[PDB]
RNA sequence: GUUUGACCUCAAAUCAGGUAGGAGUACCCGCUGAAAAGCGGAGGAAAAGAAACCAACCGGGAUUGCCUUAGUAACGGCGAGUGAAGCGGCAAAAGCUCAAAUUUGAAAUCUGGUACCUUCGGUGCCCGAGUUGUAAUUUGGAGAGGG
């Protein structure tokens, strides 16, 4: 076929040529156990689905329909944040405690400023592998970004050690090789 | 929002990362057809300021033209190909010595999202048939040269119009 | 055009082949050489559509699991339609005596599955529904008390019931743990099971409403804790044909703990007499006249109580009449019983 | 294989918890049996009964021989099973899980129930349930015609039964049901005779649909089974009439 | 884990629903073009149209068309002749919408299918689309947050 031929010829012409160092920061990404614990963290903070939302809405609406106005109390919803402009919006306050960044986006240029932007804003970013795995934890097909701001007190101590873990595993390991021109070796 | 980043990064075209992406994508599109359907705008901010929305009834074609203008001919190709679609607009993405690449937003007036949603229902009007064929698009109005200014004078088609002004004579019932 | 290859038909119907095997057995579609017009009849069927919908449903279940979203999978499973079997049962058997004619094979499988132990491939819920429907079927027989024929064998217990026309020849194998055969495939017998289950289900509906009582049969739970049988069910309200129904009228038995309780219990219920077993008693004897027992040495040896080996019941109902019990007295030898077939 | 770094820690922590509760059970039961109740929690024992948040009623223990049916549960999450409980499950033949057995309950029997509580499930059985188990399941290890003889045979021949049980005069496996329910003359004859039990797994598992069943059952088991680790743990009893509807 | 699944891409559908073509063509709009023809595209009009305008004033104020500017300015072997525009008077008058900073205390948005209903649609349910952004709010004449 043609499309199989092109998708195999793709990633050959990339690595054969010199990639700029603002790329290939991607795939210098998080290792196995740390990404695993990051997913264990963010599955604790799944956002509400449309079905669960509408279900709670029907519950409270049937409550008010009886009326049976039970109380007026709810702390806040805490969830991951996943809209890209919303993720950037949570930076430049700053509010992002952790950011996950997908390596694979076909318009890469949507994403390329985010490591430098969280670098200058001091936000603990981490480059995650695969936007589908982001979409799974956020009930989308893909997400390509994952910001997290608000955390319960049960999880806040896990958050800080995860931040220190990432800054040890990502910011220390890959920082100098981030500056280097990747690829260029023929296929 | 992140669009300001994309615009300011987009203004630096011969910068290393953008020419890298450009050089990959020109070969990648060279693999494909002259005209095909793109899944998404490669320059989303430019598509927004040309009027793209991400919903059903918005079709993005990527079109290849050999080096009228090149942009308007690129619009005419996808206007001829997808006749049911109405051409919203178009923009440059990429070029080679052999070909320039354009990314064209077309809008379907048949989809009920477009037939409702009164920001865009005007394009369902049959006066908006084939705007590129009459040069009613943005590049069409530029090549027609229709603005306000003394720099804008009688040019080509309007020249025949004012030739028409010299060609016809006006007489009243009572001669003046 | 008369013969169609199974691959051709299964790709024209766009169904999986195992589900095509379901549908052929399920509608009674018979031959890799199949009638074109029968497949044309099969070509539109909502159960086929719900099968394809179940395929897509399981695909959406797989993406629900692979995304890990448990609650949406719960919503999918709860908001799920079930294909029923019932319409082609009625348009397959419109005339109810044809269902009475073809209930005969339908009983036999369900009784065998009611005997069968719980496995992985056959769910217990399957076996639960089987044992429930089979106990219902036996409890209906003990209402009118109308069978006539009895057969004792190394292969099964063949009873045919004289009910609304034909005598119906159902068999129960004894309640023994069976070594499962690895040679068989359940995937066919489960389809037969479900088809016969739904068919016999609606036939039990017409037989319970036609007998004028409530189609769901209530049971006392502690009566079921005594014994899981037809005698667990109580049967509500909203003569007997001579002699076999109300044979042994006003007759009080004392079945032992030694005897097989089940088929003798059902025979006494076909008689209308009472059942008293000491096996039921130790869960926790004024009118008892007769012991059904098969033991060499009888302990208390009450001369008032009659001591009988159970073939007397097997021979009296095969004759419809009373016989002397000197042969059936332990430990006298027995006539080699050859049943009326 | 490279196993992992985490499982080796979790097993150690879980074995620490289990050895601690087992030592607590052993010390408390030694002080009870030696009758030196001076500074302990409680003197007399208790029994939980979960029926249908669902109603959980407690009784004091009655020093009366009660027929129980035990059902081996898969133990807790990552636990190495300790050798004290391994000894008891070895005696009671409860390894190779989904495996129950009928047992006699006395006050000498009772202290081990507090020990092996996180690995089995208990309750009051019914005669129909015992009947169904024996008429549908059960194999006997058997010395046959000409065998290498690790040889097991399903329960069909009552004459094989009255062969090896003629000294007690026990015939006709219905009577074995009757005397397991009865326990008037001899239960333990039948108990050593019926020596293996096997129950199927309730859910087939691997496949799209049955994983839902597995998750719902893990949630149900989390609701039902309770792990006190107090050494004054009330003995949890469940409806085996409900349980064998699932597993048989 | 040699398994399973997310995606993403690309195919296939006698799948569902839609749509393009051709004729005519006085007027309109584009393209090509000689000594007009031709091509393409529409509508009852079309186009243009709400200043990156005109002015130099005591400033004017979207576009369109008429009268005047005016056969003037300007151009042109400054030969043949070519040939405007501002202002003024009038007709008609109408202004609006996006794209930029978050709703993040809950995508609030919509197509489609189905069941009903008062059907150029409505309600419910369910698939989907969509965070690589659909809604509300804001287009400088500001506007937003609050009070």
From Swiss-Prot, chain A:
One GO-annotated biological process of the protein: cytoplasmic translation
Keywords of the record: Cytoplasm, Ribonucleoprotein, Ribosomal protein
Record localization: Cytoplasm
One cellular component term from this protein's GO annotations in UniProt: cytosol
GO MF term set: RNA binding; structural constituent of ribosome
Primary location class: cytoplasm
Description of how the protein assembles with itself and partners: Component of the large ribosomal subunit (LSU). Mature yeast ribosomes consist of a small (40S) and a large (60S) subunit. The 40S small subunit contains 1 molecule of ribosomal RNA (18S rRNA) and 33 different proteins (encoded by 57 genes). The large 60S subunit contains 3 rRNA molecules (25S, 5.8S and 5S rRNA) and 46 different proteins (encoded by 81 genes).
Note: Present with 238000 molecules/cell in log phase SD medium. There are 2 genes for eL8 in yeast.
Function: Component of the ribosome, a large ribonucleoprotein complex responsible for the synthesis of proteins in the cell. The small ribosomal subunit (SSU) binds messenger RNAs (mRNAs) and translates the encoded message by selecting cognate aminoacyl-transfer RNA (tRNA) molecules. The large subunit (LSU) contains the ribosomal catalytic site termed the peptidyl transferase center (PTC), which catalyzes the formation of peptide bonds, thereby polymerizing the amino acids delivered by tRNAs into a polypeptide chain.
Family statement drawn from the similarity comment of this UniProt entry: Belongs to the eukaryotic ribosomal protein eL8 family.
The protein's name: Large ribosomal subunit protein eL8A
Shown chain mapped onto the complete sequence: 53 to 239 of 256
Curated annotation (Swiss-Prot), chain B:
GO cellular component: cytosol; cytosolic large ribosomal subunit
Note: There are 2 genes for eL15 in yeast.
PANTHER family with a match to the protein in the record: LARGE RIBOSOMAL SUBUNIT PROTEIN EL15, RIBOSOMAL PROTEIN L15
UniProt protein name: Large ribosomal subunit protein eL15A
InterPro entries reported in the protein's UniProt record: Rbsml_eL15_core_dom_sf, Ribosomal_eL15, Ribosomal_eL15_CS, Ribosomal_uL23/eL15/eS24_sf
Subunit structure: Component of the large ribosomal subunit (LSU). Mature yeast ribosomes consist of a small (40S) and a large (60S) subunit. The 40S small subunit contains 1 molecule of ribosomal RNA (18S rRNA) and 33 different proteins (encoded by 57 genes). The large 60S subunit contains 3 rRNA molecules (25S, 5.8S and 5S rRNA) and 46 different proteins (encoded by 81 genes).
Function: Component of the ribosome, a large ribonucleoprotein complex responsible for the synthesis of proteins in the cell. The small ribosomal subunit (SSU) binds messenger RNAs (mRNAs) and translates the encoded message by selecting cognate aminoacyl-transfer RNA (tRNA) molecules. The large subunit (LSU) contains the ribosomal catalytic site termed the peptidyl transferase center (PTC), which catalyzes the formation of peptide bonds, thereby polymerizing the amino acids delivered by tRNAs into a polypeptide chain.
Key words, A-Z: Cytoplasm, Ribonucleoprotein, Ribosomal protein
Any GO BP: cytoplasmic translation
GO molecular function, one term: RNA binding
Compartments reported by the entry: Cytoplasm
Swiss-Prot record, chain C:
Induction: Expression is down-regulated prior to the diauxic shift.
GO cellular component terms given for this protein: nucleolus; nucleoplasm; nucleus; PeBoW complex; preribosome, large subunit precursor
Subcellular location: Nucleus, Nucleolus; Nucleus, Nucleoplasm
Keywords assigned by UniProt, alphabetized: Coiled coil, Nucleus, Phosphoprotein, Ribosome biogenesis, rRNA processing
GO terms under biological process: maturation of 5.8S rRNA from tricistronic rRNA transcript (SSU-rRNA, 5.8S rRNA, LSU-rRNA); maturation of LSU-rRNA from tricistronic rRNA transcript (SSU-rRNA, 5.8S rRNA, LSU-rRNA); maturation of SSU-rRNA from tricistronic rRNA transcript (SSU-rRNA, 5.8S rRNA, LSU-rRNA); ribosomal large subunit biogenesis; rRNA processing
The BRCT domain, residue ranges: 243-330
Region Sufficient for interaction with ERB1: start-end pairs: 32-341
Keyword Magnesium: no
Domain of life, per lineage: Eukaryota
Any one GO molecular function term: large ribosomal subunit rRNA binding
Knockout mutant characteristics: Essential gene. Reduced assembly of 60S ribosomes and accumulation of halfmer polyribosomes.
Subunit composition and interactions: Component of the NOP7 complex, composed of ERB1, NOP7 and YTM1. The complex is held together by ERB1, which interacts with NOP7 via its N-terminal domain and with YTM1 via a high-affinity interaction between the seven-bladed beta-propeller domains of the 2 proteins. The NOP7 complex associates with the 66S pre-ribosome. Also interacts with NOG1. May also associate with the origin recognition complex (ORC complex).
Protein family (similarity comment): Belongs to the pescadillo family.
Additional information: Present with 4530 molecules/cell in log phase SD medium.
Range covered out of full length: 13 to 460 of 605
Swiss-Prot record, chain D:
Name listed for the protein in its UniProt record: Ribosome biogenesis protein RLP7
GO biological process: exonucleolytic trimming to generate mature 5'-end of 5.8S rRNA from tricistronic rRNA transcript (SSU-rRNA, 5.8S rRNA, LSU-rRNA); maturation of LSU-rRNA from tricistronic rRNA transcript (SSU-rRNA, 5.8S rRNA, LSU-rRNA); ribosomal large subunit biogenesis
Function in brief: Involved in the biogenesis of the 60S ribosomal subunit. May act as a specificity factor that binds precursor rRNAs and tethers the enzymes that carry out the early 5' to 3' exonucleolytic reactions that generate the mature rRNAs.
Family affiliation: Belongs to the universal ribosomal protein uL30 family.
CC terms in the record's Gene Ontology section: cytosolic large ribosomal subunit; nucleolus; preribosome, large subunit precursor
Top-level taxon in the UniProt lineage: Eukaryota
Note: Present with 7720 molecules/cell in log phase SD medium.
